[PDB]
Symmetry: D2
Subunit: 178 residues, 4 copies
């Protein structure tokens, strides 16, 4: 019953990061936050220049190779382990493989109580925010805005197009069983 | 006639930074962006621990001392100089002294063509965004949300409460004379 | 035999971070890097303002509470899990509890092949570097420079006082069994 | 007589940034620090993708175009203006044009009291540090390590190859006339 792991899925600039920081402030018990971005951070810089690594096409694309997935997996098993170890875990990801991505997670998650959250946002709005940000390579937002959700089943959906983060956070927190 | 300097004024988390990055992308000619934050950056770290420096009360407050103003001024004269040197300058500030702050600028600006922009945002919304951000000390948003505009005359106002940055940017760009 | 996890221990500004990035570039197989800093990052911002959390005394001190340790532990079990999952893991830590800290790790590590590395540096030199950095609160370097190693047994020691990071990296890489 | 502006010149990873932060802490009067990097920051992101802008060849190269120089100049006149306005200004640059770069500065500086500082460092050592850093594109260090100084006349030289930043700072501070 007790929610042991929250998994957020949404394209870039859909507002995931903000929701996470908000959820952390909201939720009474300490929740650790990890993600694909923090994984990239943990991975050697060359992984971004390697073959089976990950590359960011200048058009805003993103392609993941086996070398990257290999690591990505053991990492997943690791986060799950922290949860089973008793740590509350928040994870914002980007299901490039849509449904496929969610299955991958499911196999690692096992019978662990997980709250599946979908973070949507108008591609155009996202793209616009992508600019105001300056952080990412123009293109990713529009590219992931939809495909990522394609086929994924959530327990809670939030659209940051017209809802503030703190708000989306509140909607999510409301589904977290203590 | 030609707009030589854009000055943005708005409380923390009102969305200034984003607007700036957007304006830069929008406007055809290169615009250099500078601000109170980038000034803090240029100032020695101790300025934040000095007397006549600047201190961030844990309640989200902010107080500026003469040492800080002293520098702040020569800095202002400097940005103005870059403009007169022919560089298009964007400046997002936070008029803690409200009207007083705008006068200070006016004296440095001289007869230089300046577009005064006000960036407003619902204090609560801002405060909420302040959380999603994680960057600033909880409190500043709500504290500056209004006072800063008190008595300031703008050429263009934008409220990021329900308008995206790219949008506010567009509204602003529309007043920039080439 | 095969080295599955590298654990670095050294006071702040002793040069750990740099060594890590270097090791990652050097070592042929991809090594994931995690640490106390990245943990702080994953922890909710309030953990830094909470009771049993972690607080940075203005004199450069640092004290960890049970709430923090609680998380810290499950996190540890998690990193170990990633290793057993097959991911090569690098971990730069700061054994505030000296020997005590190493035992804590040992219990999580189990019979996992681990390379214990000590990163030393002249307190004064460190303190000086602490300034050039601007990142940390003046004081931590000098405070941890020695205590942290007190009682800890390593497999390899490196002193960044007169040795470059890339160099220390090389010395370390040389003890990593493939 | 009174030193009104300190200009540092050295290739990437030669240790400039650190020296600056150190000098700021050392020197009694507040010194504002600006640089080519902070300029890049102030320039629109597209300037990095524009023609007469600036581009970072993947081999670690760097080429500046007229559009970039155009801005770069007015910016220079601006920093000089801040100095004449009474602000003490520190500037760490990278004279890609070697001697040519110093002349450019000289014309803007005028008869302003300036302390010319050269920051040297063994190319290899720099390259190594470039790795430990993770910040820059592998290649720049080795490429600029020497050319930049070629033909430039300094008032003080410091080699961070075997000298800490705080140290180099001290050597520099010693030439600053109050
Ligand atoms: C570091 C960065 O900019 N990452 C963004 C997402 O934040 C990129 O769209 C991305 C998407 C999916 C991904 N993945 O799932 O492997 C890796 C990067
Ligand atoms: C660095 C930081 O967090 N600055 C925020 C604004 O961004 C703070 O509210 C602030 C407001 C006004 C100011 N000032 O005008 O001197 C300095 C800091
Ligand atoms: C975030 C930061 O500045 N951390 C530095 C180390 O990098 C601090 O000395 C520290 C040391 C030990 C620690 N711990 O082990 O819990 C946490 C922070
Ligand atoms: C942003 C960055 O990585 N800049 C480094 C220097 O720090 C690069 O070598 C560089 C050198 C000279 C330069 N310039 O002088 O125009 C611009 C960038």
């Amino acid at each position: 019953m007790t929610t042991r792991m929250i998994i957020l899925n949404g394209g870039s600039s859909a507002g995931k990061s903000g929701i996470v920081r908000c959820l952390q402030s909201v939720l009474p018990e300490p929740w650790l936050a990890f993600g694909v971005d923090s994984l990239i951070e943990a991975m050697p810089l060359k992984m971004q220049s390697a073959e089976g690594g990950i590359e960011f096409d200048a058009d805003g694309g993103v392609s993941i190779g086996p070398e990257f997935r290999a690591l990505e997996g053991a990492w997943a098993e690791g986060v799950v382990a922290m949860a089973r170890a008793g740590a509350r875990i928040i994870i914002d990801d980007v299901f490039l493989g849509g449904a496929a991505a969610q299955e991958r997670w499911r196999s690692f998650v096992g019978d662990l109580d997980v709250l599946w959250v979908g973070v949507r946002c108008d591609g155009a709005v996202a793209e616009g925010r992508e600019t105001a940000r300056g952080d990412r390579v123009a293109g990713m937002a529009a590219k992931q805005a939809y495909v990522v959700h394609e086929g994924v089943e959530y327990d809670v959906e939030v659209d940051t197009t017209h809802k503030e983060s703190i708000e989306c956070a509140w909607a999510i927190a409301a589904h977290v069983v203590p």
